[PDB]
Amino acid sequence: HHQRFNVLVCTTIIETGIDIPTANTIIIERADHFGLAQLHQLRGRVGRSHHQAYAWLLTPHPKAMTTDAQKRLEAIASLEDLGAGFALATHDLEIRG
DNA sequence: ACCGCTGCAAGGAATAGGATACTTGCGGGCTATATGGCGGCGAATACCC
Numbered sequence A: 001h002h003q004r005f006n007v008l009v010c011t012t013i014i015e016t017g018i019d020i021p022t023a024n025t026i027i028i029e030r031a032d033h034f035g036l037a038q039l040h041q042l043r044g045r046v047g048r049s050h051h052q053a054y055a056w057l058l059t060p061h062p063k064a065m066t067t068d069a070q071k072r073l074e075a076i077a078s079l080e081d082l083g084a085g086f087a088l089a090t091h092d093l094e095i096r097g
Numbered sequence B: 001a002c003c004g005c006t007g008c009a010a011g012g013a014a015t016a017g018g019a020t021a022c023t024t025g026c027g028g029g030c031t032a033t034a035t036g037g038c039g040g041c042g043a044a045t046a047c048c049c
Helices: A036-044 A067-078 A085-092
Strands: A025-027 A054-056
Touching: A036 A067, A036 A085, A067 A085
Parallel strands: A025 A054
Antiparallel strands: none
8 A cells, every 4th residue: 555565476365456556567477277257357457547557468388278278368368448347258158158 | 270372174266187977870689462374174063944
């Protein structure tokens, strides 16, 4: 809240989100196993300000990726705009079933 | 000599992956209703006395 330290390493407790407008960038390390809902939620958790945020996504080797991980990543990359969570939920329907 | 604490299991949300019950086509193994040929002849009816 006082922003005395800049970057925080954390597990998925960050997912609920208490985002501060100061935070404007998220870098992940594991991109092979994460649900689309979590991906979009952590994407949109940033912001609450006028300043252009960012979402840097780090992936291990493409060949280490299973088919489903490729589908999730290509789907999340395909859509990037406001009002994207609901449509992504519609797509997740027929995916998770 | 009593207590609040740490810590160590039990039960919820997200992914990969083999086992294994289930379904199917077969291969061999078995059982069980006609219509263009005559001629001769002898027996068997039919007949009308």
